[PDB]
Symmetry: C5
Subunit: 276 residues, 5 copies
């Protein structure tokens, strides 16, 4: 009663979590999804801050420290009970157990995905009004522009597979937190699995619903003083469009995200510990 949960018990807590989430009031789900969109946006802002000025640093060392900074948003989601689309894909365990319906799964996923977008877009506005892009002599905004520009240059299969790898890591972090009982147990078990996906360039749909939109805003409304300082032009980031974001990144990464956490984490552990 003070010891970590075992893999069979962690599977039952995952099942009850999905029964709770899918049966919560819709507006509560939307409000918790807006907080999770804001939490993932804060974590990406922390990642961009920590990775500003790190071109002289070893590539993997810079990516790792920024990945530990991105871990805050997932810890916030778990401790504060926010609804993140990636983690909410694990309600498939409750679906496989027949404890929830397909319409309950579909309505919860649309509520969380849409709310996560509203929260991520609201944080872009506040981040734009803060003048943060001009930090480090515009190097903060150039980091966002360069991060957002690469996330739109992947092929469909590359984006789907990068999404599978990201939600596998996120859902394994959320699954391992089920074993935890304290706040330190749950939080620290999630640092390394998130650092990994962020350092390894895996794609998360909600994280990208903040990064690419923010880079599109910088390219469009950045000052000429920004372009002078960073020594570039908006035409170097011409492919940073809303349509390129949905087609090139959002659609394939989201498809991959569902497959990663749903099939690999959720349905595997249901087969091993719950199908019985």
């Amino acid at each position: 009663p003070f010891d970590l949960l075992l893999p069979a018990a962690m599977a039952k807590v995952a099942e009850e979590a999905g029964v709770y989430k899918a049966t919560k009031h819709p507006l509560k789900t939307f409000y918790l999804a807006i907080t999770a969109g804001v939490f993932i946006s804060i974590a990406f802002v922390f990642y961009i801050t920590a990775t500003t000025g790190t071109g002289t640093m070893p590539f993997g060392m810079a990516k790792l420290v920024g990945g530990i900074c991105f871990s805050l948003g997932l810890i916030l989601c778990v401790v504060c009970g926010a609804d993140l689309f990636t983690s909410t894909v694990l309600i498939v365990v409750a679906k496989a157990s027949g404890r929830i319906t397909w319409g309950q799964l579909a309505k919860n996923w649309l509520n969380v995905y849409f709310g996560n977008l509203v929260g991520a877009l609201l944080f872009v506005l506040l981040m734009w009004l803060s003048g943060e892009y001009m930090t480090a002599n515009g190097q903060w905004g150039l980091n966002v522009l360069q991060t957002a520009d690469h996330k739109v240059h992947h092929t469909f299969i590359e984006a789907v597979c990068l999404g599978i790898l990201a939600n596998l890591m996120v859902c394994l972090a959320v699954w391992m937190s089920y074993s935890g009982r304290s706040l330190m147990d749950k939080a620290f078990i999630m640092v390394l699995p998130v650092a990994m996906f962020v350092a390894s360039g895996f794609e998360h749909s909600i994280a990208n619903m903040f990064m690419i939109p923010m880079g599109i805003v910088i390219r469009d409304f950045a000052s000429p003083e920004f372009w002078t300082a960073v020594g570039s032009a908006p035409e170097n980031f011409s492919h940073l469009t809303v349509m390129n974001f949905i087609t090139d990144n959002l659609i394939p990464v989201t498809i991959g995200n569902i497959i990663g956490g749903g099939l690999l984490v959720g349905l595997t552990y249901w087969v091993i510990y719950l199908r019985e």
Copy 2:
């Protein structure tokens, strides 16, 4: 009974905390507010110490390590029960529940804000008498001068939004500590959320009530040996005035601080878990 609190229970502990704080004796509130002004001043002195000599270092890596150093002051506030204006804005949860009155909220906020200023100003005196500005051949005082000078060059909207972002981070750190039961749980859950706001250049009213006043004192009473060593003049910091501090930074950052923690952390979680 050994496990972390859940989001609904954390909301009730936030409500009872505000009922406690707003109903404490006024002089106890003033004395705890002076300690919190001193605690935030110590954390900024630690930030300045850690970030002295870091112009050769990657911008975000230097900001992150100084942000972990600033986390000490918030941990001190939480463990030692000090009254910080930013965290005391969460007494709006008790106000929304009708458990406290508007005059109780207004009197507690003025008591904490004024006491936080007295504590921050008392630490400036002790820091000035210590000769700390001449540390690192005056590089410690130049770090304070350069930090204080930028905090006065923001537009009203930029300062308000930077204040919203800071108190959102501070109040989310304080909210997540409510889940904690041990000293390690509460303290470590607050490191990354504070590092973020400090590394990301967000503005905290009480932190600025120490930084800018300290930079004004250095500009005015620094020795000619200081200006020789740092290779600058007081005229490079002409906009570091008390009037510029209140108008350019204090008023807008404080307005933003109330909106960040009160509306975003407090009233959101009251709607989701307490409005019932």
Copy 3:
């Protein structure tokens, strides 16, 4: 009842773990072995990510930080209950106690080894489809090529002894986690012992069932744009063949792995605490 287990009690939990593992359903053992093959593959991908760009860094400092990144896969195996061939060699404690049969030990080892290979090979496919080898301008794939190429140049005795050293470290990490009761205890006790084997270049059979196969795939299907960027040719990695992998690395490292954990960790602790 809240204190760490003592060496005698940790030996009994090791015995009961082997009785559980060897008596689990075969398909459950195969499925948990596929997850462990994927978990060790994720840890090596994290190691490669963190160690990309670190030729300018001190050799041991770069190896140590990548070793902490590889620790995630073992933590995942322990918390999520996955079957790793290295840790499953400790079922020899149950065999020595006469609590399991030799055919039970042989069938479990073949089930785990084969499943660990399937999981490691499935992750190579996903990693190849992600385009990750072209990360850091191909420096990610060159790190894999250079890591895989050295792991095939050892003599039989060197490979056997490097395998003994690796499984001694892995099984001592798994043994020390038996003392732990919380998730933080079990996880953190395993970081330094795994970092050591990874930093010290010891050889793990399942880790190599991902690294060398992945390097063979890069050498064979890498783009000419990859070879241009990394400034090399596939002929620099001619000895990266499937046959060289089995003979030069897989067979001797696996023999060594059994001796390291089975004889040194398992049969020693059985003699001291269970032979009674």
Copy 4:
């Protein structure tokens, strides 16, 4: 009963600690004071070791890592129950409660201060006999000489105020450990507050009773091979005398140390939580 102590309860544990310490047998107090003098000496030796060779490093980053190394001595004092003059100043809480007499407070302070000096001086002897000053080609002894030389060049007010700041940090670390219940809680809560005072150049009387005496011994008995390697002469450290130590540093820093922890930590918390 598993949760951290609250500020009111931490004040009562501080009161009972002072009643215990002031009423312990005098020889037990002297022996525990000699251990605390040795513990603070070990922490300064660790600080000097970690900060040797760090002139190429950013000033604050080098000071911070050495400050975490100095934290060991305070952790040792708290866990092993040693009597450190700085922490024993908090017996003023028991004095203010009328639970101890003024003669009990005076006799305990003289016993601890004298014993702390004996322990610090005994460690200087062992450190001198070890030949440690010649480590890093004499750079270890030059670090001690340069650290000790600056600690004697402060004005009386600067030294008193640097002593107030040091014992405020030390006594706040000791106060926050009262909230802790486990060994990890108590130890980790004391790392950042001690790192701060060490990184920020604050002055501790017992730490200086090891540093300056050790630098005086190096200046006087260092080999000519030492002066050749470090490229200096004893005449560069002419002000490192026993009389300069007492007048320039010991007397004012000790006065400041009493004011810092006694008045600021002890009498403040007694007014807020115990004067009732």
Copy 5:
């Protein structure tokens, strides 16, 4: 019952530990001593790995990180119950209490010292067969050669005093682990005290029974390709002999080790908390 042990209770657990250790079966003591010789050998191999390539790094920063790597071996000894000669010197507390006889103390010390040598020498063989000396282009073996060569150039008094300082640190780490109740408490309380002795160049008899023997083996059986790569000759390490090891290092460091932990940690704490 969940709180750390107090200094008086930690003294009684130290007394009962020595009564257990000295009364264990001799062959169990020999087998646990062989594991401790292997555990300290692994920690030194980790130290050498982490400190390879660190001549460009600040001396103290490199020594500190390698010292955290050496901490693994002591954690392993404590968690896995191994018999290390340094920690077994604390059975003097049971001897002083009259709970064990002088012949029991002498027989246990010889059993542990001899077994620690067998384990350290067995790990040298495995490390030699692994080809690890050629790691980092022979820089791993040169680090061992340079570490082993300096450990033989100390005077008798320097070696005795460096041994006193090492076992004081090791026995204080073991004493502080007695306060711990969890695996994280016991393990983390031992990291900084061990890092200190390793970073500060203190001498441990069992650690040296692996380092110097390993350097003698490299000097004697290293390939001419090793000497070419490292750009040296065996004649640069002529004083690395077995006879120089015993006389110059083993005998004086062991004498010092007994005095450090026995008299300073054991007999002091027995006088303060057990002589009653």
